[PDB]
């Protein structure tokens, strides 16, 4: 009745009641990019607060403890000159620790604790400068929203190709880029039993595209047509057109993935068809034209279908003369 | 509201429900009367005119419950005599067909245990829902007389209790009647052995019954405690609102005497 | 301006000149580096952890395992807070003893009240882990912070500033909870040793085994009620019951209390059965509405005043005596004391659940053993065993949920009185009318109110065996025309249960007469013998509204002594019928 | 008796008596970054401590070579400005090389040999800030913590499955995010000989898993069951149930290898099985529940078993009857 996942390709799970939390304190970088824009933008500007007013109390705690904000003083030098508030070590903080570094709150040679703290400052500051650029490059070089930018047909149909009976569906691209070694992976998912008694509930069996070798390897500029011929040791063998039926439990996945091309960062796509989603005895129209010296693609007849007459009947049935 | 309530109010009568909100009104007004007259009197700076009307007033206090507690037992009395014999002359004039479609069971509860809660349960539930609602309403009137912007708030505070009563309700009107879900077959359980004590006994079957006795016991059991940890968590959800009402009534009352005139004495007055 | 201390004489008080910890300013300045090191460590754990992971995903709703030390760090980090808000507010007001903004009296207990939240939602979240590595900084952060407050110490006794001397008691017992934190993390480091029930998904009740800040305010049910509005909620969202509070462990707990081993029986094995649940409902009743002394006052605290090192650390006197810092008292103590009266409302219904459950199968088990000669010659009707599960348990059942406030009643008057006798004295004693009046005109209307509930209940239980041969027997009626006679019957024995009615109507009205009508003629007898009579003394407006606050928490529970005295009776008699249902005969084997 | 990679997935080797040491030397960048956290760490300050001491030297040693240590001076300038001491020098170091730059310590246009030093200053302060921040980045950045979030079980099985014997295990994800191009690699591992006398010690031989093409690509959201067909052309086609005990020289690795989906770096987890951690006859629980428009997984009931008759003979005994 529900989809395992959704047509965006956003998945439909819970994952209940786990135990083991503690390796999830295990994996602290997957977890910090695993966020939210907000969540991440957040732990952001806290990260470099948290360091920024950490450093600033230890810079007026060692301000307070040479006297400095004390004014009844002689001739003595500071510290660090010019720091008579909380808000100056603030300052001071600030520009030694993203290294802007103004000069009027400059750090003499006074005690070496000072020297200390400055070291230990541009260490810890340093590495999380490390951290926290190439955690958001990390975050904005991802390349499920490349997976955005990929559409599949809105309906898959079955029709006729070649004497056999056929799974076909359209997968497109909208950008001149490309997709680096494309992966197809297509899973017929339903409850089924063993013969034996063992009912699984959601199970997952692949069924193999029709490619000429059989290697799951397509090469995508135009918008093809992926194609399964429903034959006897595929799963589908015994599907009728009179089970395409909301409230049936028959589900395809496809899984588009491989590496796109300008950045070198894998991604997936994914997109499942449901029993009245998959139009019985249809088959897509030609829509790629050639004028001018171009080849063209029309994107506005991506999912009409220009259906034709079929046997109504099973993959078993088609057996028969 | 619900109508039935007013159909109680025919059984009362309007010249004791009349009676009953004279009385009410009069002894709430005579109670605050007599917090006003202790404001005008620890307020000294003429003694002994205060201290008689000290005493005629506390004289109106004590005839004021006495004709309160008089009008609830006889509203009790007149709606335990009222709702029986109605009933009785309805139930004597009746069709077969009436009773033969009819489970017994039920008409019988409502001569039972309706009839039980009718003339027991209900006056002095009466008296403490009269009592306690003109008494939290008059303590809002002397609270809103001294310090105003109490007035301002009242406006969220109340109105989110509201939303709260409204977060409530609903799963009430789920969980109570789940509590009559499982009221309902245990004592006709209880009717089964009775009725065929020498068949069970018979067919040996008195652990399995024992068994369904306590399935029906432990399904009725956690449901009389799953209502009654929503009742609590209710009740420790308003209380602290009433906690928070205590603590910006006494910091704009010392906010509001400190810094204007408030005579030391209305602040205990909006405090009590 | 701001500082962190004050530019008072505004060359001093940032000096070092001796070693640098004989500098107060030091010492508190010294007092906020472990609480932004809890902060800013545990801030990142917490936020990759538990909470902003998107945990709408599920980390075991149920099975919440509680640790040792668990129900007293609890209890240890409320008793901090309130030494902390107290801390907070004697910070306050010696801030505003001078001018010009000294922000070293409070904000290190303002990074001790963030520091205090989060480890307690860090000891709860690890709490949820079963991952105690993870606790480990924790435990640093006490000593840490312990050793900061005895580096403030010492420098109190360094200064001589003594015992008058508020903070001087403030950081003391600072110390020493600081100090029993660091026992009890060393507790868990003696028996978890780093270096559950298998509750089911049956159960789904969870207040046996959720967290005490949520045994207190019910933060489990915030789900099962927004969900409620989602979905209608069935027999089997609720769950099962968990293995204490069952039926059959209750029903085991009282035949061990039976053949441990009348009336006297029933009732003495009905203690032993459940009177360790039943002394910490009335320990939880005990010590509610003696924190609600504390109410009155702080009334005559506030309007007594507001009819009215150099000195300003210290405070003692005066601080008790503003008012400010009453009312938040009255506040935490309002807070504490509602929490206090509604668990133990939540444990005494739960005890007398728990018996509704033990001898509803004990009934059930008197049922299987009993012999068919009482229901067909004589004795037993069968209507009046549906009353004895029906009525006859109930009614024991309310008295279960009316025992703690019989047991709390005396404990509140009489500490009533004496803080009477404190804001009063023997002016007050002219209102000992509650000692000289109550109980023996209760115990009167008690006789009175027992015999009119005994005799309305032999008719009650008349009238419904009468009707119960009446329902069953309609259709004889209607067929042979003795429907009027019959309901001329009904209607004389209602008659006879309307004027048992009519005798326990004006018995039960003139005990609430007398209920509400003593504490106002109590509240007259002060006023005019504090006046009159003992003339000249004083009246203050102080100790007229900390009295009439005092009559009125005196007359809060009188008006609940009238329904204790409605109950009772019934329990008695239900008893008795139970007793003697208990005793009747039996099948030989 | 023991292990050869543990259930955590690190693996038991030794790698004893190695000769060229001079090709470990050839790699600095991966023994680098394969150290431990506090080797890191110690490495990173000593890196940029010895890069600011030296430079030190290198300032303190021209100021001292300028004379401008000596104050007995006229109306000259300084290289350097207001350096009187080596600690000076040590804060004009840190100050130039990090790029903070406070300008009391400046440095004026006497001396060409100061801008030289100050050219190869921020030339190698530079470089060693790009070499220590990406292998800081590098070091937190793979992918192998993501597989600490990956369960498999605790127990494999072997079943019956459409007549045949298979052995089966249940993969899991813990988290939301996604496996690109999940490969699974199952090899038994076991001393065994040639027919010729060929005794090798530790052998690898790779088991399929069956897929319903036969490709080794799986799409891990739900825990699944990889199961494998005990087959003739298996290895495990004469393992008797009374073989699995423990000293019994058979081991099962199961390896799920692939990119992550947030970070585009690939991961590797890999989980034994023994003889006494494989349980013969049983079979795994439904875990999965659909209720309110959601699947669910529980994670509890994940090596639960739910244990079956079965034959309890090998499968060349399978093949008559």
Known sequence: ?321 | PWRACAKYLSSAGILLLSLLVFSQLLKHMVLVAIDYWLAKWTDSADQTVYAMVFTVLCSLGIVLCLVTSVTVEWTGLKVAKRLHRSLLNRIILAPMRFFETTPLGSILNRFSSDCNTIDQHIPSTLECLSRSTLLCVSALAVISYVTPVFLVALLPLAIVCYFIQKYFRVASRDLQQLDDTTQLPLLSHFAETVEGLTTIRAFRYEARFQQKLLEYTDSNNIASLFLTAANRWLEVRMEYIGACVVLIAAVTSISNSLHRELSAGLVGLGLT | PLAFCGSENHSAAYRVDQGVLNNGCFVDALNVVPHVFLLFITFPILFIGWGSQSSKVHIHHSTWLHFPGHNLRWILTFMLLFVLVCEIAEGILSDGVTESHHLHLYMPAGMAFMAAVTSVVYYHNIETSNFPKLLIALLVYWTLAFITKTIKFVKFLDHAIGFSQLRFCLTGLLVILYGMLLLVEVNVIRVRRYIEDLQDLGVRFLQPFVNLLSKGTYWWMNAFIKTAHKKPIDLRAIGKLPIAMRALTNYQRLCEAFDAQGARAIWQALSHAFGRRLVLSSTFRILADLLGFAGPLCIFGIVDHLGKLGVYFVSSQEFLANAYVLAVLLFLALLLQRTFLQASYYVAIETGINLRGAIQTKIYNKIMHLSTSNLSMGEMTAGQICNLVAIDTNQLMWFFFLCPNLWAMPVQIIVGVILLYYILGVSALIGAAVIILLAPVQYFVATKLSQAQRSTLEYSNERLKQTNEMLRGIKLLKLYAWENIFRTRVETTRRKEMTSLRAFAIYTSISIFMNTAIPIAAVLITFVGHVSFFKEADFSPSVAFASLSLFHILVTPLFLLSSVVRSTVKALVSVQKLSEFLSSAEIRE
């Open chain 1, 1 to 321: 009745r529900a989809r395992f996942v959704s047509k965006k390709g956003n998945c439909n799970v819970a994952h209940k009641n786990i135990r083991e939390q503690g390796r999830f304190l295990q994996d602290v970088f997957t977890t910090l990019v695993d966020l939210k824009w907000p969540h991440t933008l957040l732990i952001f500007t806290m990260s470099f607060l948290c360091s920024w007013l950490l450093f600033a109390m230890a810079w007026w705690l060692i301000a307070f403890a040479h006297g400095d904000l004390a004014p009844s003083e002689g001739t003595a030098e500071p510290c660090v000159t010019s720091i008579h508030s909380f808000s100056s070590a603030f300052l001071f903080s600030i520009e030694v620790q993203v290294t802007i570094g103004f000069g009027g709150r400059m750090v003499t040679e006074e005690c070496p604790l000072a020297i200390l703290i400055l070291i230990v400052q541009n260490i810890v500051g340093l590495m999380i400068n490390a951290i926290m650029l190439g955690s958001i490059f990390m975050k904005t070089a991802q390349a499920h929203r490349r997976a955005e930018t990929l559409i599949f047909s809105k309906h898959a149909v079955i029709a006729l190709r070649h004497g056999r009976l056929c799974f076909m569906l359209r997968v497109g691209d909208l950008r001149k880029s490309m997709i680096i070694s494309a992966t197809i992976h297509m899973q017929v998912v339903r409850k089924t039993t063993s013969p034996e008694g063992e009912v699984v509930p959601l199970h997952q069996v692949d069924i193999p595209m029709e490619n000429g070798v059989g290697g799951n390897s397509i090469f995508l500029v135009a918008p093809l047509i992926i194609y399964h011929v429903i034959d006897a040791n595929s799963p589908l063998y015994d599907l009728a057109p009179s089970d395409l039926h909301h409230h049936q439990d028959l589900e395809i996945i496809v899984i588009l993935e491989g590496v796109v091309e300008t950045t070198g960062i894998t991604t997936q796509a994914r997109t499942s068809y449901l029993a009245d989603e998959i139009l019985w005895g249809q088959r897509f129209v030609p829509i790629v034209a050639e004028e001018d010296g171009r080849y063209s693609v029309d994107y506005s007849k991506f999912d009409n279908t220009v259906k034709v007459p079929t046997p109504l009947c099973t993959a078993r049935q088609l057996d028969e003369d």
